[PDB]
Design a protein around this nucleic acid. Structure first.
Lengths: 109, 48, 48, 122
RNA sequence: UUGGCGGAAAGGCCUUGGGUGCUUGCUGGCGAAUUGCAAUGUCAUUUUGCGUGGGGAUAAAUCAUUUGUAUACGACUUAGAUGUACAACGGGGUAUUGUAAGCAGUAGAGUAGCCUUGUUGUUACGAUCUGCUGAGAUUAAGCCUUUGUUGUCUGAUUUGU
RNA sequence: GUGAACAGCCUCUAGUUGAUAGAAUAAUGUAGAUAAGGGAAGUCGGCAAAAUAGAUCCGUAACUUCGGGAUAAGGAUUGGC
RNA sequence: GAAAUUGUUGAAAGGGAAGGGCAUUUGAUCAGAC
């Protein structure tokens, strides 16, 4: 239905990966992004861009960046619609540093 | 309140404080007030 | 609320630290006023 | 079949502390609920007063495999398969009433007492 | 119906007034039979349900989500329908380390070249040094605070004297 | 490549990414560790662990079958430019 | 197409076993005799 909005978020992975096993840090950061998008968009299913997968794993299994800037977008579901008519699709954001930014809404064009 | 009366030569003592610690408990606190910290350190780059 | 440190002058005759400084540990309990709402009466019975 | 299984808060609904989510056993059952529903609708049944009136599970023949144990031993590694039956029925009203007459036998002393009450009041 | 008393588990006791039925206090009239020669010969109170007709009133709990003063799992303790509400961020404070990258310097053991033939001659290399710089980075994951930005707030099950 | 080294550690060619997974982080375990002051008082017993350790220079006892003991013991140094 | 063992429905009982004996109450069922 409505609310096809896309917004930019900063996620603090440092507070979420605190004290996690080293071989699990990058894999758990994957599950944190999906839980993060579900919270802010309410969608059960969350899809990650493969180039966002690179951003998490850029510095190995235990070198995840403290902060990531994300472009989370809610979109209509297609291709034999599942129970959820809306899904969240998450992009990385190319910035010099992800610290000090506030959540903003991206215009639709 | 206490259930009994105790003199005990220790419970009748009049306690008058002299100094209360207000340093940070979130680390090895060094200063008691933000004014004290500003005087010891001086001006910083955060300050204008 | 938490713990903190106090300095006060000990006063007990016959002690080595009489009229001399002692550093001391205290705990602070936060106590706003309590609102009285209701009252209950208790009869004294053979079963308590 | 609950010995030394874990506890969960979602058993409160049923008055139990041990409950579990048998995904394999669930999917088998709801595949047979679908089959019975199709069978009922092929029979002209309403499908709105349908309820599960009978469902039973009993043991199928075992399927055999082998386990290797320490000091050169072989032990059974078996499957416990299931046969499943279920029946869906239309719910109906009360069955019947007005049971048998149950003819009653009175002694002559009891019969006279009854007539004494009829004679004694309107 | 009037007025009291009783909290040990009072839940009952006493009392005022009127109405009503009976009265074996005394003297009369009618009825009983056939349950057949006895057969407990059925008269008590427990709970529940379905009906009427007459009043009375219009909730919560659990699951799911959430917190960590709790925790193996259960369990515990918080929060959530429009607000000194909750959350994600950002800001500030508090802490830890010890002075970031970049740029500049007539700093720098010295070496080599250049000619404009030195006299601070310049250039090339050069660990490190000085200044911007108690800077920069991290700061709740079980730290504190918030006039900022953004979002969220009606899904499931069950319970009745 | 480091390095005396077909050591140990990292990489190239080539080959794998195979061993049921998910969530939490109680006790007790297996494996790995660190501890103030003391320093074997523990224990049958220093069992286990710790300490020493490469290289260069200096120095090296008793005893001896004269070959050894010996790396005896015991000191110093170690980077970069 | 037995038993051990098992599911479903029905009935009943169950305060740290169960099962048994004598006797009877209660519930279910039943033959004979007329």
């Amino acid at each position: 239905l409505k609310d096809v909005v896309t917004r930019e978020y900063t996620i603090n992975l440092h507070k979420r990966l605190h004290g996690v096993s080293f071989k699990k840090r990058a894999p758990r950061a994957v599950k944190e992004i999906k839980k993060f998008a579900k919270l802010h968009m309410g969608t059960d299913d969350v899809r990650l861009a493969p180039e966002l997968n690179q951003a998490i794993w850029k510095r190995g299994v235990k070198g995840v960046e403290y902060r990531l800037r994300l472009r989370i977008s809610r979109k209509r579901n297609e291709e034999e619609d599942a129970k959820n008519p809306l899904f969240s699709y998450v992009e990385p954001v190319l910035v010099a540093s992800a610290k000090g930014l506030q959540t903003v809404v991206v215009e639709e064009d | 309140k206490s259930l009994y009366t105790n003199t005990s030569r220790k419970a009748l003592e009049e306690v008058s404080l002299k100094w209360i610690d207000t340093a940070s408990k979130f680390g090895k606190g060094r200063f008691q007030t933000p004014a004290e910290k500003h005087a010891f350190m001086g001006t910083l780059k955060k300050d204008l | 609320a938490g713990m903190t440190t106090i300095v006060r002058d000990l006063d007990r005759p016959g002690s080595k630290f009489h009229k001399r400084e002692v550093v001391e540990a205290v705990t602070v309990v936060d106590t706003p006023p309590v609102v009285v709402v209701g009252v209950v009466g208790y009869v004294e019975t053979p079963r308590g | 079949f609950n010995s030394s299984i874990g506890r969960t808060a979602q058993g409160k609904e049923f008055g139990v502390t041990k409950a579990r989510w048998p995904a394999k056993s669930v999917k088998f059952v709801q595949g047979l609920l679908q089959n019975a529903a199709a069978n009922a609708e092929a029979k002209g049944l309403d499908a709105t007063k349908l309820y599960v009136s009978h469902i039973q599970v009993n043991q199928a023949p075992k399927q055999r495999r082998r386990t290797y144990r320490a000091h050169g031993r072989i032990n059974k590694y078996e499957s416990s398969p299931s046969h499943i039956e279920l029946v869906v029925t239309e719910k109906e009203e009360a069955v019947a009433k007005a049971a048998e007459k149950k003819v009653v036998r009175l002694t002559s002393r009891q019969r006279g007492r009854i007539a004494a009450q009829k004679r004694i009041a309107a």
